[PDB]
Design a protein around this ligand. Structure first.
Ligand SMILES: NC(=O)c1ccc[n+]([C@@H]2O[C@H](COP(=O)([O-])OP(=O)(O)OC[C@H]3O[C@@H](n4cnc5c(N)ncnc54)[C@H](OP(=O)(O)O)[C@@H]3O)[C@@H](O)[C@H]2O)c1
Ligand SMILES: [Ca+2]
Ligand SMILES: [Ca+2]
Lengths: 282, 280
């Protein structure tokens, strides 16, 4: 029971449909190219002839398209959307989430915007987390079904929040990964084995030092417990740059990180907190 | 093995003081020394003996814990008193400097460990404190129990430069991660999202469950982030969202530029981890 329709059968859409099939939903799939449905049909999905069919098969509609492609893909369903719910899992920016909400509401359709926080292969498995924003009543109604994809975290009722959080978190992820790669290059230049360093960095340093220092620096969280003044950190960075030069490793990462600090000291004090770096960007 | 081992601490800045106080708390006979007078008094209050000069300080203990700002200049006058003692140097800047200190120590007949303090002064001698060490394994095993009073002691290997190398590495990751976090916080903050709650989500969940897992997934020798090209698209959305929110795009622009360089060097369609080959 609990019928669900998935629109969009790229790598992620297919993972979504397959996970719902694995939990035993009646899953109807739809895709622009008809080739991509066959493996899901093999797994017990019904392929919809057309979008009206797809949409009418289920009260819940899970959308995972390539971007725009929402309006063009589901538009022809017209009045069949009325009284249904769209869970849009692809949005690029908050403005696009907001446009999709307007579109949905214009058709009498409930709307949730979601951000998938794991790769396709993790969808449906323990550890999977999806962020949602939109109507709380819609969320509470479909919570149990959404839980088959990933632990569902409701951020608030405004449409654009999930994509905002997602873009924010991903921005941190890229910077952290790049810093990690500089670190691994640095120890690798002396022939340190990467696996063991990586475990030290990730199982210990990341949560015990990086996480605690972020919470220490955050002015509204109260580890005793600080990154120290900007000046002290500029000196630390100079040693990291020195170390990179003597090891033959590119100094771009730590040079940039240092330059940023120099701008903050200039705007503020050698004594100002690390967190005040943020005021350069807002 | 002497539970009350005499120890000398040279350098009484915020960190050196924390070191000395932690050893005093664990019942060592601690002699302290600093260049500038005036920093020793609180430690003397706690039971430390103040050394007049560095020969005095050095000749009081077989174990010498050094925590200077910079070593050669401070301990130079004690050249001959150094013979048969052990230096634990907790403040080298680079691996080369650690190696120079080793050569200098060994020349004078003194054992040498280099250490990196991984917590702030207020955490020294408290739960969670960790110190990284490198140098002679016999020196390490001899003083391990004493060093444990400062922080959980992790021996990385016998080569002098390793502790500073690991420390600089780890700290390089920390700065990048913090800067990314600050961009994230600015971004949610621009919509009026409260910072505390976002910070706890980012740190208590995202950091270990996502950032740490993906690093381990990308690391070729541990058993992902998708191709480089997929990630450039994701970064373009982050830039777009940053522009719509009125938040400076520097951080995600620089991250994106790095990926563009990687795809240009022929690492497009390769794994994210291959970005590393741009730097070595
Ligand atoms: N505090 C932290 O957050 C932290 C965390 C981890 C690691 N560490 C490391 O621990 C080291 C020691 O730090 P600290 O907190 O004690 O402050 P610091 O400013 O790095 O060092 C101050 C100490 O170094 C001495 N010093 C400076 N120049 C000297 C010279 N030419 N000859 C002899 N002594 C000299 C100072 O003596 P005077 O007082 O006479 O000038 C003072 O005792 C740091 O450099 C840092 O790399 C610090
Ligand atoms: Ca705080
Ligand atoms: Ca791996």
């Amino acid at each position: 029971n609990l019928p669900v329709t998935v629109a969009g059968l790229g790598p992620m859409g297919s993972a979504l449909a397959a996970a719902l099939l694995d939990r035993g939903h009646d899953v109807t799939v739809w895709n622009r190219s008809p080739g991509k449905a066959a493996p899901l049909v093999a797994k017990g999905a019904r392929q919809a002839d057309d979008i009206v069919d797809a949409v009418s098969a289920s009260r819940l509609l899970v959308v995972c398209l390539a971007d725009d492609a929402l309006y063009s893909a589901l538009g022809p369903a017209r009045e069949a959307l009325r009284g249904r719910v769209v869970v849009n899992l692809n949005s690029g920016t908050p403005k696009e989430a907001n446009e999709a909400l307007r579109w949905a509401e214009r058709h009498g359709t409930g709307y949730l915007d979601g951000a998938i926080m794991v790769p396709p292969a993790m969808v449906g498995h323990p550890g999977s987390v999806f962020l949602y924003s939109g109507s709380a009543e819609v969320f509470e109604e479909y919570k149990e079904t959404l839980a088959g994809l990933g632990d569902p975290v409701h951020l608030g009722t405004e449409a654009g929040l999930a994509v905002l959080y997602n873009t924010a978190l991903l921005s941190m992820m890229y910077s952290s990964m790049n810093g990690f790669l500089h670190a691994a290059a640095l120890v690798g230049s002396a022939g340190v084995p990467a696996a063991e360093f990586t475990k030290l960095a990730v199982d210990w340093f990341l949560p015990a030092v990086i996480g605690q220092i972020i919470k220490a620096q955050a002015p509204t969280i109260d580890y005793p417990g600080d990154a120290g003044s900007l000046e002290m950190n500029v000196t630390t960075l100079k040693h990291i740059i020195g170390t990179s030069q003597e090891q033959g490793v590119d100094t771009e990462i730590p040079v940039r990180n240092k330059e940023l600090l120099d701008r903050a000291v200039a705007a503020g004090f050698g004594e100002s907190s690390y967190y005040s770096v943020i005021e350069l960007w807002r």
